């Protein structure tokens, strides 16, 4: 579809709106002092607006404009352009809406202590490693996908903290270990396979917070972790997603 952009408020352009509709406009939006009228294709209009085809990028920007702060106690996840007046700890992330990210942040605050060394396995946006530093931890975030690291570093800088970010997996992290706590938002089957190595990555008495786990697959993880010698410490879920916390 195409957009016909006109300068002015809906209130100001009220007189020509019927014209846009008769002209075939299917949508109208007031966007920062402009009125955007949406059509299947450009048509001849005397209002002196400007035509432009709508693309995926336009959709992205619109969606982004509609985003609002997302609570995830004790934190609040904010877009870089968001302002926040509350008491919760700000986590500014470039567009935290996932159930698993919420479960992990909440569990992190409980199991993490100031001065703990943290491994955030599959760091992605880097949100968990960042929150770890905000809580007073010293974190290393790793991901097998290099593409995400630049954005992770950018997010970190925006939050005024600096965790270490690195390409790779668990093996790539060991040199910087052992760690006091490992947080991993992956999936049931992967956690199960890594159970033995999670134990090796943590100091005695260390913690493992696992999420990205679907309820009907929870048993797989309880079984692999017990088998690896971990004791269960906490369970929480949101929707069909669960987080399992263990002690080593």
UniProtKB/Swiss-Prot annotation:
Domain remark from Swiss-Prot or TrEMBL: Contains an N-terminal substrate recognition domain and a C-terminal methyltransferase domain, connected by a flexible linker.
Mind telling me which PANTHER family this protein's record contains? ELECTRON TRANSFER FLAVOPROTEIN BETA SUBUNIT LYSINE METHYLTRANSFERASE (PTHR43648:SF1)
Q: Which family does it belong to?
A: Belongs to the methyltransferase superfamily. PrmA family.
Q: What is this protein called?
A: Ribosomal protein L11 methyltransferase
- What is the stated purpose of this protein? Methylates ribosomal protein L11. Preferentially recognizes free L11 before its incorporation into 50S subunits. This function is dispensable for growth and thermostability.
Which key words tag this protein in UniProt? Cytoplasm, Methyltransferase, S-adenosyl-L-methionine, Transferase
Query: What GO molecular function terms would the record report?
Result: protein-lysine N-methyltransferase activity
| InterPro entries assigned to the protein according to its UniProt record, in alphabetical order | Ribosomal_L11_MeTrfase_PrmA, Ribosomal_PrmA_MeTrfase, SAM-dependent_MTases_sf
The record's Gene3D superfamilies line, in alphabetical order, gives: 1.20.5.1350, Sun protein, domain 3, Vaccinia Virus protein VP39
Give me any GO biological process, just one. Answer: methylation
* Reactions this protein catalyses: L-lysyl-[protein] + 3 S-adenosyl-L-methionine = N(6),N(6),N(6)-trimethyl-L-lysyl-[protein] + 3 S-adenosyl-L-homocysteine + 3 H(+); an N-terminal L-alpha-aminoacyl-[protein] + 3 S-adenosyl-L-methionine = an N-terminal trimethyl-L-alpha-aminoacyl-[protein] + 3 S-adenosyl-L-homocysteine + 3 H(+)
- Give the CC-aspect GO terms: cytoplasm
The EC code for this enzyme is: 2.1.1.-
Compartments (UniProt record): Cytoplasm
Per the UniProt record, the source organism is: Thermus thermophilus (strain ATCC 27634 / DSM 579 / HB8)
By which gene is this protein encoded? prmA
Instruction: Give the matching SUPFAM superfamilies.
Output: S-adenosyl-L-methionine-dependent methyltransferases
| Observed phenotype of the null mutant | Mutant contains unmethylated protein L11. Null mutant is perfectly viable.
> What residues does S-adenosyl-L-methionine bind to?
101, 122, 143, 169, 185
